[PDB]
Design an enzyme around this catalytic site. Structure first.
Site, PDB file in Angstrom:
ATOM      1  N   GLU A  67       0.897  -1.133   0.000  1.00  0.00           N
ATOM      2  CA  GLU A  67       0.000   0.000   0.000  1.00  0.00           C
ATOM      3  C   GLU A  67       0.937   1.185   0.000  1.00  0.00           C
ATOM      4  O   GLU A  67       1.167   1.820   1.023  1.00  0.00           O
ATOM      5  CB  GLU A  67      -0.978  -0.067   1.194  1.00  0.00           C
ATOM      6  N   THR A 101       2.688   4.921  -1.333  1.00  0.00           N
ATOM      7  CA  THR A 101       2.192   6.301  -1.301  1.00  0.00           C
ATOM      8  C   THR A 101       1.124   6.556  -2.396  1.00  0.00           C
ATOM      9  O   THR A 101       0.143   7.268  -2.142  1.00  0.00           O
ATOM     10  CB  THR A 101       3.355   7.317  -1.402  1.00  0.00           C
ATOM     11  N   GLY A 116      -0.947   4.207  -4.158  1.00  0.00           N
ATOM     12  CA  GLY A 116      -2.154   3.391  -4.192  1.00  0.00           C
ATOM     13  C   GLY A 116      -1.836   1.979  -3.798  1.00  0.00           C
ATOM     14  O   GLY A 116      -0.708   1.696  -3.451  1.00  0.00           O
ATOM     15  N   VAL A 129      -0.948  -1.876  -4.365  1.00  0.00           N
ATOM     16  CA  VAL A 129      -0.281  -2.721  -5.370  1.00  0.00           C
ATOM     17  C   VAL A 129      -0.700  -4.118  -5.037  1.00  0.00           C
ATOM     18  O   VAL A 129      -0.548  -4.550  -3.901  1.00  0.00           O
ATOM     19  CB  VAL A 129       1.253  -2.592  -5.356  1.00  0.00           C
ATOM     20  N   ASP A 139      11.634  -7.809  -2.376  1.00  0.00           N
ATOM     21  CA  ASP A 139      12.223  -6.415  -2.358  1.00  0.00           C
ATOM     22  C   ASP A 139      13.456  -6.435  -1.504  1.00  0.00           C
ATOM     23  O   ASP A 139      13.723  -7.394  -0.781  1.00  0.00           O
ATOM     24  CB  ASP A 139      11.218  -5.336  -1.997  1.00  0.00           C
ATOM     25  N   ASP A 149      12.434   9.076  -5.311  1.00  0.00           N
ATOM     26  CA  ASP A 149      11.997   8.356  -4.107  1.00  0.00           C
ATOM     27  C   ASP A 149      12.599   6.944  -3.965  1.00  0.00           C
ATOM     28  O   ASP A 149      11.887   5.937  -3.801  1.00  0.00           O
ATOM     29  CB  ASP A 149      10.464   8.291  -4.012  1.00  0.00           C
TER      30      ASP A 149
END
Length: 277
Positions: free
Chosen positions: A12, A14, A16, A18, A76, A117
């Site tokens: 979730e 910044t 929306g 995913v 990730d 970012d």
């Protein structure tokens, strides 16, 4: 969206939610992010293709909504670092990830596209030793401050490709030490953590700093610390490169292209990580 079956909520961010999702016309498994200038900008990103950039497969503006369909990666760097916490990521794997991300950035930057970012959660890895930049160019089109360049924190409106080098340098240090370098919890706390480590900037090291929008003469004046104390037990080549990536002056900060020629990468290789999916 009618063509996609949602499988799992990945995140979730910044921008929306995913979801991991499956396409029905193809059976492909994808990451679906549910979010006219934005549409045109986003459309430009469909062409910014490189092996170290998460591929944007499709951009669906339907039912007056915006969905971005990305290639899916299984892990990730945040979760990989949390998994390697007791032993640490091996240096050769650190060096390969850094080099690959620099290739990614050198490509985007050569097209004048900035990430803006970068953070461990936006760096995705696969079983083949690859690492890729995710959410690239979306910022143009709680939030973590930990990776933000000081020029951003000081209110510069027209910041440069250097901001991405700063962020990647912070990530590099975190790979090596297994701790975030600058884990600020407010803008001033982020700025003061940076000053405590690198010294409070001045006109000597950063011409024009004292004219930045949020610069205050009343900032406490801390002296710089030694990189040998910041990132032990990184070697002299790594510490040299790191120092160049964390220069205060955005114009002195090393470019991605030049970083790729740094002696640190003389012996780079491409190891395969140990991935538990």
């Amino acid at each position: 969206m009618e063509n996609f079956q949602k499988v799992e909520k990945i995140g979730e961010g910044t921008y929306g939610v995913v979801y991991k999702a499956r396409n029905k016309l193809t059976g492909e498994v994808v990451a679906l992010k549910k979010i006219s200038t934005a549409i045109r900008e986003i459309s430009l990103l469909k062409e910014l293709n490189h092996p170290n950039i998460v591929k944007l497969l499709d951009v669906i503006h339907t039912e007056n909504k915006l969905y971005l369909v990305f290639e899916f990666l299984h892990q990730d760097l945040k979760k990989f670092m949390d998994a390697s916490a007791l032993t640490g990521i091996p240096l050769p794997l650190i060096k390969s990830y850094l080099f690959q991300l620099l290739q990614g950035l050198a490509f985007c930057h050569s097209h004048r596209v900035l990430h803006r970012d970068l953070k461990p959660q936006n760096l995705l890895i696969n079983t083949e030793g690859a690492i890729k930049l995710a959410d690239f160019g979306l910022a143009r089109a709680v939030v973590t401050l930990w990776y933000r360049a000081p020029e951003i924190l000081l209110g510069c409106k027209y910041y440069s490709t250097a901001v991405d080098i700063w962020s990647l340098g912070c990530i590099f240090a975190e790979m090596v030490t297994r701790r975030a370098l600058f884990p600020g919890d407010s803008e001033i706390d982020q700025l003061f953590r940076i000053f405590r480590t690198l010294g409070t900037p001045d006109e000597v090291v950063w011409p024009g700093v004292t004219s930045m929008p949020d610069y205050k003469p009343s900032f406490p004046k801390w002296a710089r610390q030694d990189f040998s104390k910041v990132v032990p037990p990184l070697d002299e080549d790594g510490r040299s490169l790191l120092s160049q990536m964390l220069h205060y002056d955005p114009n002195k900060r090393i470019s991605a292209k030049a970083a790729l020629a740094h002696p640190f990468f003389q012996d780079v290789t491409k190891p395969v990580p140990h991935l538990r999916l």
